[PDB]
Amino acid sequence: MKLSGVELRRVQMPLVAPFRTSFGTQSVRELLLLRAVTPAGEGWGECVTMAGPLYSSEYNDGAEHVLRHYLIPALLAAEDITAAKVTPLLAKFKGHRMAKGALEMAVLDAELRAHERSFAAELGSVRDSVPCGVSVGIMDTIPQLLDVVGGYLDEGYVRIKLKIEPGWDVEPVRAVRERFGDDVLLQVDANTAYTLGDAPQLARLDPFGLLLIEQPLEEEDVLGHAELARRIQTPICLDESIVSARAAADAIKLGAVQIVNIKPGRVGGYLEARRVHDVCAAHGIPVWCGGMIETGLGRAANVALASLPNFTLPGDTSASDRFYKTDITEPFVLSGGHLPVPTGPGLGVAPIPELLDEVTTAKVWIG
Amino acid sequence: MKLSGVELRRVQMPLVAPFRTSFGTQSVRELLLLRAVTPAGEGWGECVTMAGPLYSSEYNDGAEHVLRHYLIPALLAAEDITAAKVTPLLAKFKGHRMAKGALEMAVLDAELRAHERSFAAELGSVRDSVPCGVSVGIMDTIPQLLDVVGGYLDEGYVRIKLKIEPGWDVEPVRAVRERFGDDVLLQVDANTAYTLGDAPQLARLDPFGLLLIEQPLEEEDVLGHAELARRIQTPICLDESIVSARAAADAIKLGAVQIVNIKPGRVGGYLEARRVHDVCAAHGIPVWCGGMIETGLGRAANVALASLPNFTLPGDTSASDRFYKTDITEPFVLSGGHLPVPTGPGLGVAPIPELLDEVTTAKVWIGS
Amino acid sequence: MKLSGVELRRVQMPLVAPFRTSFGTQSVRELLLLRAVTPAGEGWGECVTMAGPLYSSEYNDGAEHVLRHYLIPALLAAEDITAAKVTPLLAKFKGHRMAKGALEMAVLDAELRAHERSFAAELGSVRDSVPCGVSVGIMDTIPQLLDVVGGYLDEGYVRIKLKIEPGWDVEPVRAVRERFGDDVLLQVDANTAYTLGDAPQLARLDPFGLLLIEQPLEEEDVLGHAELARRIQTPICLDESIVSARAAADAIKLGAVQIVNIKPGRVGGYLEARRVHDVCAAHGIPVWCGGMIETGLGRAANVALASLPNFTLPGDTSASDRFYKTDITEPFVLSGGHLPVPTGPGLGVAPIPELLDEVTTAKVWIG
Amino acid sequence: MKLSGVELRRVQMPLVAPFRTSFGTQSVRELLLLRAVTPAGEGWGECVTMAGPLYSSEYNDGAEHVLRHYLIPALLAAEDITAAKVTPLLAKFKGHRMAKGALEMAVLDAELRAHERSFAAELGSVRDSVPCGVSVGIMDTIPQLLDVVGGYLDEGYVRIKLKIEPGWDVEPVRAVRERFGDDVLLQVDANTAYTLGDAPQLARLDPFGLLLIEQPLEEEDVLGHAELARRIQTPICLDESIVSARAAADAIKLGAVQIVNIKPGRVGGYLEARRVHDVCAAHGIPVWCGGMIETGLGRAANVALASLPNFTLPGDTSASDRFYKTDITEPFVLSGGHLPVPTGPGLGVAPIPELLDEVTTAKVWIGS
Numbered sequence A, C: 001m002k003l004s005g006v007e008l009r010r011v012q013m014p015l016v017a018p019f020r021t022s023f024g025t026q027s028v029r030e031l032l033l034l035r036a037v038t039p040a041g042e043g044w045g046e047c048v049t050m051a052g053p054l055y056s057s058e059y060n061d062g063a064e065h066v067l068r069h070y071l072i073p074a075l076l077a078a079e080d081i082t083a084a085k086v087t088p089l090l091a092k093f094k095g096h097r098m099a100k101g102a103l104e105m106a107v108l109d110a111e112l113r114a115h116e117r118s119f120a121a122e123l124g125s126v127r128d129s130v131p132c133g134v135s136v137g138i139m140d141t142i143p144q145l146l147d148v149v150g151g152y153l154d155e156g157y158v159r160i161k162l163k164i165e166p167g168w169d170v171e172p173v174r175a176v177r178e179r180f181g182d183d184v185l186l187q188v189d190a191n192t193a194y195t196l197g198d199a200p201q202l203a204r205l206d207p208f209g210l211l212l213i214e215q216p217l218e219e220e221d222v223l224g225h226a227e228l229a230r231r232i233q234t235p236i237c238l239d240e241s242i243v244s245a246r247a248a249a250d251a252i253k254l255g256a257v258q259i260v261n262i263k264p265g266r267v268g269g270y271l272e273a274r275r276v277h278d279v280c281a282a283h284g285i286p287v288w289c290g291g292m293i294e295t296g297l298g299r300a301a302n303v304a305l306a307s308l309p310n311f312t313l314p315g316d317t318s319a320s321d322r323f324y325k326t327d328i329t330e331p332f333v334l335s336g337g338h339l340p341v342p343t344g345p346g347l348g349v350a351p352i353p354e355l356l357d358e359v360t361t362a363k364v365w366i367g
Numbered sequence B, D: 001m002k003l004s005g006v007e008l009r010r011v012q013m014p015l016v017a018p019f020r021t022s023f024g025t026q027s028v029r030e031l032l033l034l035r036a037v038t039p040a041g042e043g044w045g046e047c048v049t050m051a052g053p054l055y056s057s058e059y060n061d062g063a064e065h066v067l068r069h070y071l072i073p074a075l076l077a078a079e080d081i082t083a084a085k086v087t088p089l090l091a092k093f094k095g096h097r098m099a100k101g102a103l104e105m106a107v108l109d110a111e112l113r114a115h116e117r118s119f120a121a122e123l124g125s126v127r128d129s130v131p132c133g134v135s136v137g138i139m140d141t142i143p144q145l146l147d148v149v150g151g152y153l154d155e156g157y158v159r160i161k162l163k164i165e166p167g168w169d170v171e172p173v174r175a176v177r178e179r180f181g182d183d184v185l186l187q188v189d190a191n192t193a194y195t196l197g198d199a200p201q202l203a204r205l206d207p208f209g210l211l212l213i214e215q216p217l218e219e220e221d222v223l224g225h226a227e228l229a230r231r232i233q234t235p236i237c238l239d240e241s242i243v244s245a246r247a248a249a250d251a252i253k254l255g256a257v258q259i260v261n262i263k264p265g266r267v268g269g270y271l272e273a274r275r276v277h278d279v280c281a282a283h284g285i286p287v288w289c290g291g292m293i294e295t296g297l298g299r300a301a302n303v304a305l306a307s308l309p310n311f312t313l314p315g316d317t318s319a320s321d322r323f324y325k326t327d328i329t330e331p332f333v334l335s336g337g338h339l340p341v342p343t344g345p346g347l348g349v350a351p352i353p354e355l356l357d358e359v360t361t362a363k364v365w366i367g368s
């Protein structure tokens, strides 16, 4: 293919209910989408960055900028474009994975459509449906939490993931376990909230049979994770830390992780995410699909991804409604706690134009 | 898709010139080919087993049986098939990687063709042509070897690989480095001919600046390879041992390998092969594409495979005429020490029937 | 000796009660037997391969072919023949351990009988009888299972070995411990059914005091086992993975095994078996005899072997009748949970022709 | 079998030329032979002890005692006796390996003779002849040495083992490399003469390309050896330290040795020895046959032993005439540098009594 141009749209979507993590609160979702245009057709890309630089250094505005000034142009200048070549083409630019990730996706979708192949086929899906779990935010009250949980479990959800924070650990957990039983699948996510020094505290969760603890320490603190693993019974799971397959392998080698969360944009692409998957598998490390409160675009890609053989744990692949009343594509609807893998070319999903426009806030065409 | 059936052919191809490795002397290639049939079209698979079980446990006759009585049947027995689903589907059957890889190849080619996608595109090619080295066998005389090597160099090959064996190590290497210089890419391949006890001998090649030593020990001796490496300056490269991406991660972590030879059939398929590639890259282990005296079919798949990013070392992806006078496909021709990556759907290549029919010794159709 | 020829028979023997492993259910046993011919006398060999390649890549038909076309002929061609030399002689052929093992066996038996030596004598026995355990399959129901242990227990079986699979671990075990007590000798055998990711589930067996867990993971995953062993209380036992004395050495070295199962056919012969034994011994690794539901032929040479000094744990040397109603040789009968080492030359057993022919499907001369 | 009794004998055979070691000069060897008596027939044994406790704490007279009073009785009181069973029988008695070894030897020889099997066969020889090297002592002077050496070289011996000690290391070695060439198989043996602290001195041989250095330090100093390995280029070889298979394993595991010297007596018998061989082999550790200046008796067993597959290095399995003018058995004669493995049952050799009685100094019968 040859790249004709990309259309950068800013989008804002209201969340059904406010989302609280260790970094803050979310009431609304500001996305960034790309519409890649090649001679044959279009492809869509969704960017996982958020308003500010709280999960990671990347934020919507910095993305747009790098995309606009550096990445996109870079692609426009080459003769042949292939999803795979995107990387090597954009390699001179340091970092900015979620943005490079976004570009890749659009390109890929377009590429996959042209050949009439689904994201799932390309990625190597072995399943047609994937078990879904859910991520529950920080509550203001235990009771209000128990409700929410109970709600999700009722919806058919297979696993409960609890956002945690210093001052919202053990109790919330104790509570859930106590009320909902030990049989539930429960895990926690600190989004880098603690320190090695907090070990005893975290060690306090031992007794609860949590599947994992996701990113307790900062992104850069791999050795610390390995140390912490030594001190707690709860399995370490890395999110933020995993910026690449190489990163995964290093972490695995150093004993800093036992289970891996795979976030495609985080790692800079669905292509890279597959490698990550492959690397983990090779080392016997289980993986699961992570989420970034995406529209049915990323959602659709994630679902395909998550049907890969090593994803042996339910992912943050929740139904559409968990965050949006009105999704910009056909909605994703839980069935038997599962979500179905799209069958169509590329994403197998596309924005409903009427719908898209409504929530569009900006638009730019780079040709 | 949904498997309609597979055609099993036995092909006999004579080598323009006999090939000698540590395990034997060969003058004729015996291959096993697969034409997999789907509602969407055909696909071609090539098996790397050879007559007997000398490089590994697998051999033509054995591969054929298992394919016939177990693997093929199992795929036929499925509602859906994808190259990606072939593995899980045949997982109940232990080993037989070469057979499975061959069957996977056929399916994959057919699938790719249906989507009008090329193997390289599927695998993730980043290059459009690849550097080719050549595999030189054990000679009867140094002088003879020197000439052969001389010629390949002349055709434009970018690196030389020498088959070695106790009693055909240092000399031959000395003689070549000596005659052709230090600037040539040179490496050797034992095909499991030595033992750890042989280190002092192997340590003898230290001074030649060899790119690597390929599989000095037996296939199962990973630890010995790690030990050996502590004992020699030449870099260890594994082939036989690398039966999977998992084998590869294991050896690397064990420090038993520094450079990996990727052989698709040996690892159970082009799909597995990519994983291996990816596993190596994440560990900083360079790879290069192994060869198995394939026809244009496997050759083409290999060329594509070899255009993947981590393949930073010339592979055994020689021109067709290195082995065969008349290939069964559009031959592969060296161009500036390179081979061009195939563009068409699937393999980007296919057998010329009369050509093929002529080399065919047996054929069978396995359906439901 | 001088090899005159070999007769390849195909035998079919019905199972008293269908046997279910994690690889499947078996009601009948097809075997491959070999009759080595020397100017002196004959020798018998049995091949542990089965119908399909489920435990290992080796299967009956596969074995027949290589014997026929490569192995048998290789020996015949040789001037002098020593069981010993067999190895060297067939070394050029990669893999094919089971096959090679049977052949060696057939040769050895001849050779021994010829020196009027028993298998046990040549192997270095120190005992005259051996404790016999029993391999219990996967059942459809726990009561079923329970009856079954119960029954074997009563016959006088010294130890219990339970086939497990995912979905048949903890419970079945909770069951026999709870019903049969804590003083019973209990161990499990997953035949490669689990993954490093399933550790937690296997950790669920820590509480039952099992003597071991036989091959929780795949054949090739040695490092996985070592890791695994770091995550569970139950001692690791390797079967499939132990293909040679070197293999054993390696596994030990890597901390991947604590006890080793010796399967003579799996390692390539009785001679190699001895070697494994020794290696294990030298490293303080207890060993025990494994079984592959053999005839009295295999059974007899196994009893011999199982009399070796390091065989410190009851092996799968059950009584003939455990599998077969009628055995082609003089059956093996449990006398106080033991079984008597054969005293005659070679195996010390022979097939009762009448009985053989009764169970023989095919025959072939190779000379 | 049933053991009927053992006749013990003291032998005294003069050495051709006095042999000097790091422990002392020898002019005459004083052995201790065994004649086990069965229903069937008789077997012979040979003890590796010497006059005094200098190589190890075991000595001829000490041996006699334990045998007589502890060992021999032990077996006599047993119903069934098997070479195999000999071990477990004598287990209650701590140490005395050389002694138990000789005993087992005697027993084994009887048993093998009974089944008309050779030692070789029992052990699993795969070869018919073995390559032989020789063990050269400390000379009082270079030329002396240089001379001796060349002598041995001439008679065809394949490898050279030099006896070393502080003050007799580098020089001797330097001289022989210098004089005879670099293509010569050369190793050294210190019989525990050095200390870790002497490493620098031993590091001084780095340059000579020695195959090995045998027992630089004390028997008990495994770790020392491992450290020492770290400090020198010459591969460590253990003898004294290798008292068993388990010992071998441990040493291996700790990185204390690269090649092992096998002394059937030292390890407690030919059976153990075999085990050590297997253990080494499973660890990729080459092994070689060690010598304790033995008659035609120990010499015949060794030779069979030494034909085991992992014996990839020439042993101290020199011809009878290296030490003895007149052996008590058909002498062993170098042929092309090799020695032929015995073909008859048991040792496939036996003494020649006048030869024998001429050398015997004592005799004792031990019975039930």
Ligand SMILES: O=C(O)CCC(=O)c1ccccc1C(=O)O
Residues within 6 Å of the ligand: A055, A135, A189, A191, A239, A290, A291, A292, A293, A294, A316, A317, A318
């Ligand atoms: O998308 C989902 O289903 C939940 C996403 C989630 O928990 C999350 C949302 C924003 C930033 C980080 C994370 C996280 O998983 O760490």
Ligand SMILES: O=C(O)CCC(=O)c1ccccc1C(=O)O
Residues within 6 Å of the ligand: B021, B055, B135, B189, B191, B239, B290, B291, B292, B293, B294, B316, B317, B318
């Ligand atoms: O495909 C080629 O170009 C040569 C292949 C080769 O050298 C070879 C041929 C048969 C078996 C093993 C090997 C090898 O490379 O190890």
Ligand SMILES: O=C(O)CCC(=O)c1ccccc1C(=O)O
Residues within 6 Å of the ligand: C021, C055, C135, C189, C191, C239, C290, C291, C292, C293, C294, C316, C317, C318
């Ligand atoms: O012969 C017996 O007593 C039964 C042995 C058995 O359970 C078995 C049968 C086939 C493959 C593997 C195994 C095993 O022991 O793991």
Ligand SMILES: O=C(O)CCC(=O)c1ccccc1C(=O)O
Residues within 6 Å of the ligand: D055, D134, D135, D189, D191, D239, D290, D291, D292, D293, D294, D316, D317, D318
């Ligand atoms: O038997 C031989 O050939 C010589 C043996 C030898 O050198 C020796 C003699 C006495 C004690 C120890 C050793 C030794 O090899 O360590």
Ligand SMILES: [Mg+2]
Residues within 6 Å of the ligand: A189, A191, A214, A215, A239, A240
């Ligand atoms: Mg997270």
Ligand SMILES: [Mg+2]
Residues within 6 Å of the ligand: B189, B191, B214, B215, B239, B240, B261, B290
């Ligand atoms: Mg190779």
Ligand SMILES: [Mg+2]
Residues within 6 Å of the ligand: C189, C191, C214, C215, C239, C240, C261
């Ligand atoms: Mg088992």
Ligand SMILES: [Mg+2]
Residues within 6 Å of the ligand: D189, D191, D214, D215, D239, D240, D261, D290
């Ligand atoms: Mg010595």
